[PDB]
Design a protein around this nucleic acid. Sequence first.
RNA 1: CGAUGUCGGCUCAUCACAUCCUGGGGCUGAAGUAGGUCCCAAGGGUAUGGCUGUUCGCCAUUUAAAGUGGUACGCGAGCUGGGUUUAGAACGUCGUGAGACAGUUCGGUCCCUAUCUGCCGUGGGCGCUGGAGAACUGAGGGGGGCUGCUCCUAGUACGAGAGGACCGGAGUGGACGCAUCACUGGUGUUCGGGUUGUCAUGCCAAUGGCACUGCCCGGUAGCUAAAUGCGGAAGAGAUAAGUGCUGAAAGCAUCUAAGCACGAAACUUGCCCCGAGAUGAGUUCUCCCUGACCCUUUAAGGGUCCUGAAGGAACGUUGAAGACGACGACGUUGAUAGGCCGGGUGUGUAAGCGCAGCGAUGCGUUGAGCUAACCGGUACUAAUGAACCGUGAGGCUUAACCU
RNA 2: AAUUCCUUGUCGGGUAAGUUCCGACCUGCACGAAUGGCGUAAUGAUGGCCAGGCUGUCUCCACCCGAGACUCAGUGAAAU
RNA 3: ACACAGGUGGUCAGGUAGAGAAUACCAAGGCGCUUGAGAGAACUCGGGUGAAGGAACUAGGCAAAAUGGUGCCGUAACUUC
RNA 4: AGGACCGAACCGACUAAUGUUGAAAAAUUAGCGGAUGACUUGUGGCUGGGGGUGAAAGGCCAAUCAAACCGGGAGAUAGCU
Lengths: 114, 120, 209, 56, 121
Amino acid sequence: SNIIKQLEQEQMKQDVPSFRPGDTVEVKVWVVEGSKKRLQAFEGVVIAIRNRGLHSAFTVRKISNGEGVERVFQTHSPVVDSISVKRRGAVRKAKLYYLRERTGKAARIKERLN
Amino acid sequence: MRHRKSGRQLNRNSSHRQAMFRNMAGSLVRHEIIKTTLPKAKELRRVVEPLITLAKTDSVANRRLAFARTRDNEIVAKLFNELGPRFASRAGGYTRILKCGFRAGDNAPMAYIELVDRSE
Amino acid sequence: MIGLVGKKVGMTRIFTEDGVSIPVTVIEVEANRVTQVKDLANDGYRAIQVTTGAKKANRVTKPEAGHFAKAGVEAGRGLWEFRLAEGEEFTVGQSISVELFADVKKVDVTGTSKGKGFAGTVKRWNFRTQDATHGNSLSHRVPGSIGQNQTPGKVFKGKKMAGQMGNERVTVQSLDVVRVDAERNLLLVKGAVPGATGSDLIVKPAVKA
Amino acid sequence: AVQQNKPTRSKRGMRRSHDALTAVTSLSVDKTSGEKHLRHHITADGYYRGRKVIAK
Amino acid sequence: MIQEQTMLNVADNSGARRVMCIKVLGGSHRRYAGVGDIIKITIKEAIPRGKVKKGDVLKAVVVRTKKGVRRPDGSVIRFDGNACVLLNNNSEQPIGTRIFGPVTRELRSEKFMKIISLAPE
RNA sequence: CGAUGUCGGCUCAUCACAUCCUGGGGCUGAAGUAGGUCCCAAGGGUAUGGCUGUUCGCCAUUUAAAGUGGUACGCGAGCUGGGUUUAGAACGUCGUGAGACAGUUCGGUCCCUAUCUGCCGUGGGCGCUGGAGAACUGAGGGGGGCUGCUCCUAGUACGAGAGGACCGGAGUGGACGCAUCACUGGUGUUCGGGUUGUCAUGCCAAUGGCACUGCCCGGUAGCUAAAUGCGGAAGAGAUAAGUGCUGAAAGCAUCUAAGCACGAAACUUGCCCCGAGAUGAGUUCUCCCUGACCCUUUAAGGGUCCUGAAGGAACGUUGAAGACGACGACGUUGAUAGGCCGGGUGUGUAAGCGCAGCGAUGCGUUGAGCUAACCGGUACUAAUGAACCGUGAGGCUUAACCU
RNA sequence: AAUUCCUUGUCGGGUAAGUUCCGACCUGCACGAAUGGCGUAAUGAUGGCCAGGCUGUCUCCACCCGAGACUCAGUGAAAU
RNA sequence: ACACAGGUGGUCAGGUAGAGAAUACCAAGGCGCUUGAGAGAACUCGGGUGAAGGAACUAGGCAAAAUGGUGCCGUAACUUC
RNA sequence: AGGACCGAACCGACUAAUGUUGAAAAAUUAGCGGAUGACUUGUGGCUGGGGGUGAAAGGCCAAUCAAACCGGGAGAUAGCU
């Protein structure tokens, strides 16, 4: 509605790139360890869909220890702070959830170019 | 429940509906007016106007891609060419409806669905 | 303080700098000016009653027009009593707002639940589903038993099974004050409130937790 | 189940209280059709507020 | 996950393969769950070289929940393992001397210190 | 015995207290600590598995605790059919035999659309005394009542130490409920795309059809849990067991006889929902009707004429409302649905055309096209327009006020 | 043991925990050689058991699409 | 007993794909099954899908699921070879 | 070659579900087994009730089977209801 649009513009205050999945990213997030304003790096594999306005999603494949995580990024949370786009590619699907199953090697994808 | 869902089953499955609507679409173009069950008309309304919107704009592409939405040469030939100037006279609302009461096979309220720019 | 009747008109969640984004529900207040009064000179009560306006002045009847005009003009689609014994208010419209709850920090929020209607065992009374195909013969969403045998001979009054969901007033208590916006007439509450969009809702002060 | 006992005449007419057709006061007049017609439908000569819908 | 069964991974050098839960502790008939809680375990397979025996009853902490755990805004870290760190059963100490696997910040909080010094992410 | 379906399970409970836990105490061989035992206490809560047809039992591991017993050893016109016990069959055994088996084993039709009572909901009349429309008071009824750990107190009291509280407070969970899709997800045949086969659209291309949604991925709105929020309180009042003062009978003593004081999750409240058919029909506010006649035991009316209102429903258009009614909203002085325009969302570079490649196909055009149930706006279409139903200043008695 | 009452016998294996199962032991209530004994590869809509894959069987139920139910109109039962 | 979702033998045996009288979609050819119309509940039936777990279910993994073709590899206990 | 294997036709009925005042006095659906034979089926033929037949269940012999059905003895008899 108009009345949750005005409010929603009130909370739009990120200015961000455009992320077309197959994005490599390095997310730098406020940990708040023991009142530390350190920022921890999360190079991952974008999969999930952004927008739904305000509320957005992104997610990681990490492959830390032969297996990873997913970590939903919002791109409007302060906890997010700033998000690097890094390498991007071309892939027809907007999700790469067959990368949870089929894992490495087929994690590779084609390049978007510029 | 059906809270903020629209789209009736009507008679059967969606697979009946899409055939059943395509028939009635073309029958509308083809003969001007249709007398049928009052729910039915007010459901077919929703999804035949999108042929009519595509057809009040000149496009070759959108004609063939508008034949993904119809089948029959004739009705996409009437559309655009003959029912184009009919519907170049407006945007929005390409039928009047009006109603006509119960049917003589069993009591079932009927309405109408008919073109408004010729109906004189 | 008293609660006043706004309306929920969406739901959001609003970020804070410490990294929590609490759930929110954006109730929109719009003036609630004091129309009818109920006093202890007339015994039994010491409420105050209010308005929200209404779309037309043709959509209500001559009785529903009179009572209004005998307290200024402002429309009304409703009136909701709000007991009080002190925090006195007065019969002339006052147009009071969220501004109340800037010295309150707990609230209740007391709207109307949406309901589904039909109800049913499992779907409303939360029973188990069994005999899916392991010896199926009707048994899924059945209540199974509802009673015993002849040494009660009957089923007690107020036994759950079938009936009705919602379409009634409801509250869960609390639903704290998060932001008081008295100038856009937004009230940002903490978590999900009573009913779907378009429901009227009081927002009393709790002291009940 | 299969009932037991015979319901009484009373118990019939008691259900048939609620059985009846709504008297709509069907006949009505327009100034576009003075016909004695059922409102919000056909006049039997196509009109609804005037305007013939019928071609049959 | 499920109080009964589950086949959990070892996120730690000791033990190997499938490791069964038998009760998600906290009790009162705890339904599913476990994210960073201590849970009564029975190892089903154990490391074939080196010994802490199979079939023993121990305890473990689930640090890698495939459904997910989350905070501070409720942003969910969804694991792809189902792994835990085996723990002394009469106590609470890690028996495992190396830990590999991402872990939860809910173990940073409160007495658990030992776990989160020996694993990264 | 003119059929009262057995056990056990499942499902669904509900009651009793001879109480398992929480609560409150007495005694203690009551160091603390957890207890032991007994008294009071049913408000609430009261475990999953392994084996076995068994309930039970035994075992495993929690849990605050996994109470006991009753309800046709609770529940088959709700489910199951494994056991016992149908007819088959077999072993061992018994029997001369046919056959037999509270020994054992494998296999082996579980029927019935509810009239009535009862319950859970929900309307339709009439009533509430002129008739209406709203808003309530709150008599009553229902819901709800759980609890660990950790941190603080305090490493204090206690203890030789080891160990380690009470009282009280805070915090974070578990189980259960309640609410809600905003977040995280699921579904999403009604949205988009890929794709297998084939058939069609004259043919190519591109599509559409059909194949359990053909197969398969993602997904909108809505609904929903596995998600998220919130809830069980404090505090009163009157008490129980209990603990007491004061205190005679019975110069003392004595919690009781006179009189007073505290005292539990019980109870009455406080909290939430239903709630004036609460026929004891309550109350507050407002609105609409203030014309004639006639025939009667006449003050009780019946009928007739003129008005017919406020308001209702009907009807239509429909709703995060809905089995149907109901309720909610609107009916052209309109945003009520749909449509349209724009937005948004989801997919992911349409088609065609041009170029490259022999081709398959790629690239460019083009983060394109398409896109609902959404949102915003906009009368484009239908909400037409009469009507209908509902009447016509309020019975008697008495008090008070008013000429 | 499809044979054993006591009996969940007893020991071992498997199971986190195994009245069954499996291997043994022999105290064979009340096994036994053509009313065939003991084995047995192959076979089995065979009995029992375990394990893998796999799963809405369950945890713990949800939504969806259809056919009813529900409502209208026509027709029009039943046992009792 | 019915214009009964059942039973009933021989003969003819088309295209494409496919091993095929499978099956899928089409012929030739013949049909929509003699109540329709609405609302889309609960509940029942019939299907489809399910985050995480994966037999904890139950008398019992019953059902479903998942497996599946063809070519090629490679193949153990045991054995009446 | 094979009472061979996998599997349509055909036959048969192992599981479950739905039906169980049905659609139907035994069927339907999804699975299932057998499948050139100890097969299966059409046509016709043949065995008769104290009898047949039976890869054997007291099964089957016209929806009836531990002695069919129909007529007759016969209004059997019933100390029974």
